Amino acid sequence: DRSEDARANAELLLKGDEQTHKQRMDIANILQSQRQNQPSGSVAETPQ
């Protein structure tokens, strides 16, 4: 059991690992294009 409990342990580390990356990369590109579009809106004007 403790054996498989340790087994469940990397499970948590999976979500951790996996979804940490989720965060990381998601916001990354998010920021990126945001700024690209900022440059877009700097050449002219955002226009609401």
Place this chain on the structure above:
Amino acid sequence: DRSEDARANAELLLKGDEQTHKQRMDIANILQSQRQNQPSGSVAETPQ
């Protein structure tokens, strides 16, 4: 087990380490360009 539990221990330290940096650098540059664009919007006017 406790051995591999210690093993899971740096796992947490990984996300910690890794994603701490995520934070750090992300917001860093975030702030940076924000300010660059502030200078952009200071020369003229943000224009909504």
